[PDB]
Amino acid sequence: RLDPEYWKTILSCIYVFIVFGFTSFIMVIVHERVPDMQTYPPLPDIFLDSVPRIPWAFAMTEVCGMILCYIWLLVLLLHKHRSILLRRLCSLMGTVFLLRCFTMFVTSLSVPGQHLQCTGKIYGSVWEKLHRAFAIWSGFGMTLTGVHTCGDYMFSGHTVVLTMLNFFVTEYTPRSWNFLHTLSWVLNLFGIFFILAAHEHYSIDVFIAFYITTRLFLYYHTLANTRAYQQSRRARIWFPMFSFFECNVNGTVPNEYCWPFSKP
Amino acid sequence: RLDPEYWKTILSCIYVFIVFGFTSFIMVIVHERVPDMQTYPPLPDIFLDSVPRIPWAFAMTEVCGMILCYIWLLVLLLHKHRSILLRRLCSLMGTVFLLRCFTMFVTSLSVPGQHLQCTGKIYGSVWEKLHRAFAIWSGFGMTLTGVHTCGDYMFSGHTVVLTMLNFFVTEYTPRSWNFLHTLSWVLNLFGIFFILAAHEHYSIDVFIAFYITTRLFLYYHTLANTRAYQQSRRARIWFPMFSFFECNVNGTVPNEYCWPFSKP
Amino acid sequence: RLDPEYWKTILSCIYVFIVFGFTSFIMVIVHERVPDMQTYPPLPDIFLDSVPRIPWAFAMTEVCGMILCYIWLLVLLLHKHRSILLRRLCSLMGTVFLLRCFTMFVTSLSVPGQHLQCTGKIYGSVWEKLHRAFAIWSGFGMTLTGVHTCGDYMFSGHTVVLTMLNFFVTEYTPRSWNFLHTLSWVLNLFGIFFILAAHEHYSIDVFIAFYITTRLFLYYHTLANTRAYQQSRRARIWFPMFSFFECNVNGTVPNEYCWPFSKP
Amino acid sequence: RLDPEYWKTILSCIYVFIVFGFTSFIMVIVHERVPDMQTYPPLPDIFLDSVPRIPWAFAMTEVCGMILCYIWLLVLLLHKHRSILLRRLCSLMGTVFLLRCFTMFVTSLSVPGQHLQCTGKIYGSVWEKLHRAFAIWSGFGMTLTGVHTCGDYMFSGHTVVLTMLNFFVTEYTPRSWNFLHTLSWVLNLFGIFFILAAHEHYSIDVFIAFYITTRLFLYYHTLANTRAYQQSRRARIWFPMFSFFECNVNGTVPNEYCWPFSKP
Amino acid sequence: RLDPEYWKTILSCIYVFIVFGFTSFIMVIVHERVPDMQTYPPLPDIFLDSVPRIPWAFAMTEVCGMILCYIWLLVLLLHKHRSILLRRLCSLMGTVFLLRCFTMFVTSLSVPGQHLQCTGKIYGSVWEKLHRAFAIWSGFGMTLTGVHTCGDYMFSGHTVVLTMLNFFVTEYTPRSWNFLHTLSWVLNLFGIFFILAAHEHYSIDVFIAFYITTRLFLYYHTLANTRAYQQSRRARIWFPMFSFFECNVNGTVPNEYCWPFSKP
Amino acid sequence: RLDPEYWKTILSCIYVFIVFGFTSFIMVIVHERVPDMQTYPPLPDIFLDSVPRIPWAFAMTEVCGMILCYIWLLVLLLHKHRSILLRRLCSLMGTVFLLRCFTMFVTSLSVPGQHLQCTGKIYGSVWEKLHRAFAIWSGFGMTLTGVHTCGDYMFSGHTVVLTMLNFFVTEYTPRSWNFLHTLSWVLNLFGIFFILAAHEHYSIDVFIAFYITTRLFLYYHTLANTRAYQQSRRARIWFPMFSFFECNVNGTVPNEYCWPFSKP
Ligand SMILES: CCCCCCCCCCCC/C=C\[C@@H](O)[C@H](CO)NC(=O)CCCCCCCCCCC
Ligand SMILES: CCCCCCCCCCCC/C=C\[C@@H](O)[C@H](CO)NC(=O)CCCCCCCCCCC
Ligand SMILES: CCCCCCCCCCCC/C=C\[C@@H](O)[C@H](CO)NC(=O)CCCCCCCCCCC
Ligand SMILES: CCCCCCCCCCCC/C=C\[C@@H](O)[C@H](CO)NC(=O)CCCCCCCCCCC
Ligand SMILES: CCCCCCCCCCCC/C=C\[C@@H](O)[C@H](CO)NC(=O)CCCCCCCCCCC
Ligand SMILES: CCCCCCCCCCCC/C=C\[C@@H](O)[C@H](CO)NC(=O)CCCCCCCCCCC
């Protein structure tokens, strides 16, 4: 049966936190390989040339981000297998960000001209790069709490987070609320449009990020539902910490709702 | 029963030819939207900074290409169901090059510095666009027969052709010949390595090309083997003309080989 | 029945210590047979001539060795039949190092020009050669604790140790952990590549060392699994102290894990 | 049933001739990588330093080789299944000489000072390098007809040929003639000893050549006797052109003698 | 049944002691027939002309004899039927040294020039010949405890002792320790080579000594195992006191080993 | 059955003739290794120091050899299986003389003082030692037909021939003529006495020759009678051409006598 394991969720949380820290450190390291990165003219793209620069394009995208988390944690509160939900979400997020780190290290591609005014630069020594990494870690990347002061690289994390939250929200509700699913979909597409129209990422970057998160999420859910982690030695699943997480769960997780407060 | 439909192979070949012409025409549109494409500084990668440029590394990849195509024709000659193989191959290449057209249209990504001496430019009119289109089409894009005079763009097709031919060669030979398979894999790896070391394309270009070819090839083979084109309305398959092309053949194609010449 | 005998492991450890001391003394003696060994021009190799010397490339090999040793210690801690594993590892390493001594005494093949600054030399007598042997013995031969001051000779031991530890880690873990196996393989390959690129040994030395360790390991384990130590007079096994160590063990050793500590 | 295939032996002979030509060309090109190779002090060996040079010690090896060749020809003449023997000998020697090419291209190990009077050198171009290759090929490499004028490199071929012919003579005679076997063993040992005492190869070269020939011969014959070419996909035998040559032969080859001449 | 007779071993040991005394007597008497025996030129051999004399090659033989003797008493201690072994060994040595006495008495063959500085000579009388005889007897004939001051004679006894101890070690230690047998054979071969190369004995003397020891040992073992002392009057065996010695023992001696100490 | 083979005795004759020629050539070449050989004083032996040299001591021994072969051919003429005797006699004489050649090559031991007047010496060339070999071959070594002009070496052939003839004569007659056996025995001992008193050989040489011929003859006859040449792989008889000669003969050879003349 489905036994709720309370000592594995914290392991997933620390794992995803270490993944975020490694991503921030790799970002800091890679931001050094090019000193200026703000003098070249932009590469010819289809979308960013038609629409002129709209200064406030970031605000609503990220605010839609917290709307998505808000609905996500409300669905979390009243659903009985919350532990499995928090066990799957971090386990997927860490792997996606590890792929982002690998793509980051292989190739760097930014937007040539945005945040040409961020100051600092050339921190050559061991002591203070850790300070930048800790800042962008405990700043969580929003532009409201100013950490994202200069440019951004290939494989934007905003798109991945938005799509992952939308999919997790839409998949763990009963299949009769087809109005919240539509709202989440239009909300995610609005966020995608706005970040693309912010002139900070190229169309190919957002497209491959969206495709990668969708494919990884669907593949993980199909593998979990099929229950092939122990059926046979089918394909030697390469997902980081997959069998150690879903071995205690057999079959598909139901969608029963309850209330963990004994004070009606 | 396997009925060789000889009136559908011509349609597939015509479709592939118009696809190639369309690809040439789209490239014709693409390489005029920014004038210079040669004054920019190269983007920082890991494999374009360590290994210096080699000026004979761009023809060994193609030599491997002709080797692989000759091997594929040799395999095609001695096969009972030649029409089905020639049908599937063209159907795959059409979709792959449509994807190439799309990804080149959305964004243009080049190598800033190679083939800077190529002449022409400022070709603004309607009449002679078809001229370079026909030249690139009936020059087949090799660097030996000089057509590839200026630089190349996103989603290189050389790796696409090499990977498709390699996988087709390894697929339709009896499963005891994995010494030719080793040779084909070595040829594909050498072609990829020389493409990368010729300073013709970025690393992510080659990686996404290889991954998309492998994924499309394996997915199409699984779909064809599972005879899901008419079993049920599973996903409304998105392949250009798939049900039209594979409806007359049921089950998995065997590995019976014969000799079409009746003169021993 | 598997009987863990604690009075044979001490014998195996003593045997390995004696073999290591003999190897150190033989190396000390061999270092005298050539006066300079540091003025000749290096022989033309295909790896030593393409990649210039990397000054820091030798410590990474010992780092990989330390990581593999830590993993092997962890495996030995959590195994039911630890004594048999410890008896087998020593019984293999002793034979391999005896072969190293023989092939070092047959011919001396050094690298002419590395560690050319090392002092000492011409310590001709019986009284202080043993001092150098004792230093090399109780310095463990690593360059971190500086004992390896002059060059090294044929049949390098670093590759032997790395390959033996990697094979023992790979084989004595459950056959479902196929990411630890890949990590160990990557570590071993990187160690071999670094020892080759540090201008420390010729390519043939590393290749023959790897082949000899692999063949000896596979042959010994096949003989142990086939119980050919008592089945018949097949070949009069030439492994030093083989039948004595495996007479009490029948069949193959299972993979049961436990915790020797009785305080949960 | 043993079917003597008369159309495969020609293929084996052609394969051996091609391999020999390739080996000669690779030796010719390898000889250029070091300018002098005749001024360095020799490496300290234990056999090259005890026994001074004997000027006439090299022709005895070729005399023993000719005696063994005559005995093997006599055995081949009076055997029922001559074709299989001729098809096996070539298929083994080709692989061994390919291994020789690989291990002598990887590293070069010559004797610095013997045949120091040989003239020629620096024939740099493509037109007359093939002339040197042709001379070495159609001189058979024997010193009686002077072609082997300068030094030789690692993995000597004289020991390979002697050991292969000795093993073929020993194994393919009735198991009651144990004085011919002793004579062949004595001839092979004397040939190896004269090779070592003629100051032509280091001890490790001869030892590894002998071991490699013995191991390859025993492995090939064990695989042929156990009939593993069609039993299952055990290990995918790496012998070049192995399954093709032994497909029609089942079991083991008997030892019935006859006389092909029909005029008693 | 094997009944250990402890009243017959003493007789055999006493007989051996009188045999040794008579051997010293015969050597002393024979030494007086030729006054000088040191001015002759050496007889031409094949092995006394190539290798020059080595001054330390005479003590290594006795070191090998001592270690073989120690191994022999180690085997003697742990044997159930120790008395039978001690009876047979002494019975063999008595006959061998009687034949040695005979072959010195008929003819004298010496090495002309070694130990030419030994003093004494011309000791013609009865009284003090007993003194030198007793010195040779209770000096046991080693060169370390200096008794062997002058030259030696035909049919060297060093090879006799080495071969007898070697064959006794290999026969009466169970038939599967086929590593100790190799060590004993190597020791015997090294002893023979050193006594030959020490310019102490002619080659024919060593060869006939080895042959006679091997023949007598094997013949006695076959005679004892076949139990021909009472089967019939076959040939009236000529061995000194053979039927009186092995009358009790019936059949082949088994190889049961025990521990005579009752204090674990 | 016992079939007379007439095409094998000629092989025996040619084999023994080649052995005789090889012995003569070896004697000729070995005679060169000492120039003078006639200045040393005789070694101390018991028998040649007592009785003075008899100048006419050689003749009667050799004419008694003539008597021996006379009675041998008389027995040959009137016995039915003469072919088997002519096969065995030469097959044994060849092996004995090969042993004589080996022992002559290893060590040379002569009589220093007899035949001081033979002239010639120092034939340093290639041409004329063959003349001496041919002379001593087609002079058959008698002292009557003067060829044997100087001294002889160890392993005298006269003793071997006399003993072999005596044994062959005494074994192939019915066991009821115990007066001719006594005549042959006293005749043989007379020949031995006379040749050893001719101051022509040492006692040890004659004793060794007699023992070797007796042992070889008895061993060959026991092997032939036991019929172990095909019973099993007992000891792999080392006799030169043993199984080839005695495979057509089964059991013991009888002693039926007849007359091959049809003219009574
Ligand atoms: C429930 C999941 C919460 C995840 C929140 C993401 C925080 C990542 C910060 C780690 C530092 C790495 C630096 C940069 C990258 O992360 C990229 C680069 O722009 N920035 C980002 O992705 C920032 C994503 C902002 C939109 C998230 C909306 C969901 C809000 C949940 C808040 C509790
Ligand atoms: C059998 C199929 C052959 C197709 C080969 C290329 C045809 C593409 C024509 C369409 C117009 C676009 C032109 C060029 C682009 O495609 C890209 C841009 O760099 N260049 C290319 O692809 C050129 C790839 C050459 C390597 C192929 C080696 C295999 C040899 C087989 C020859 C029969
Ligand atoms: C777990 C097994 C530990 C074995 C360590 C052996 C230490 C030296 C003993 C042999 C004496 C002869 C001296 C030197 C030669 O052996 C060669 C010369 O290059 N140096 C060596 O091999 C030294 C091996 C270095 C790599 C080991 C990495 C694994 C780390 C485990 C250590 C706890
Ligand atoms: C029956 C087998 C015949 C094989 C003869 C091979 C002749 C050379 C062909 C290979 C081309 C490369 C050239 C040289 C190298 O190979 C090495 C260099 O040291 N020379 C060799 O190996 C030549 C081996 C000589 C000893 C053979 C004795 C057996 C007598 C048969 C003679 C016809
Ligand atoms: C266990 C029995 C050991 C006996 C060995 C010889 C004892 C003396 C024999 C009788 C007196 C004649 C004296 C000498 C002659 O025999 C010859 C002439 O050179 N010298 C010898 O033999 C001396 C042979 C020494 C080497 C043997 C090594 C074994 C060590 C065992 C010691 C307990
Ligand atoms: C039927 C057997 C015939 C044997 C005849 C042997 C003649 C040559 C022997 C071998 C060639 C080497 C030459 C000489 C040495 O051997 C020694 C030198 O001292 N001379 C010998 O031994 C010759 C021994 C003569 C005494 C025997 C007499 C009977 C002869 C019968 C012949 C019809």
The arrangement of helices and strands of chain A along the chain is HHHHHHHH
Count the DSSP helices of chain A: 8
Strand-residue proportion of chain A: under 5%
Amount of helix of chain A: 40-55%
Greatest chain-chain interface? A-B, 20 and 20 residues
- End-to-end Cα distance of chain A: 29 Å
Rg result of chain A: 20 Å
Helix and strand composition category of chain A: mainly alpha
Number of domains of chain A: 1
Seen as an oligomer or otherwise, the chain set is homohexamer
Membrane topology (chains A, B, C, D, E, F): Multi-pass membrane protein
Keywords (chains A, B, C, D, E, F): Endoplasmic reticulum, Lipid metabolism, Membrane, Sphingolipid metabolism, Transferase, Transmembrane, Transmembrane helix
GO cellular component, one term (chains A, B, C, D, E, F): cytosol
GO molecular function (chains A, B, C, D, E, F): ceramide cholinephosphotransferase activity; sphingomyelin synthase activity
Task: Please describe what this structure looks like.
- Six copies of one chain form a homohexamer.
- Chain A has 264 residues and is mainly alpha-helical.
- Helix content of chain A is 53%, strand content 0%.
- Chain A has one domain.
- Chain A has eight helices and no strands.
- Chains in contact: A-B, A-C, C-D, D-F, E-F.
- The structure holds the ligand CCCCCCCCCCCC/C=C\[C@@H](O)[C@H](CO)NC(=O)CCCCCCCCCCC (6 copies).
- The site of one ligand UJO has 16 residues of chain C, from helix 1, helix 2, helix 4 and helix 5.
- Chains A, B, C, D, E, F: Belongs to the sphingomyelin synthase family.
- Chains A, B, C, D, E, F: It is a multi-pass membrane protein.
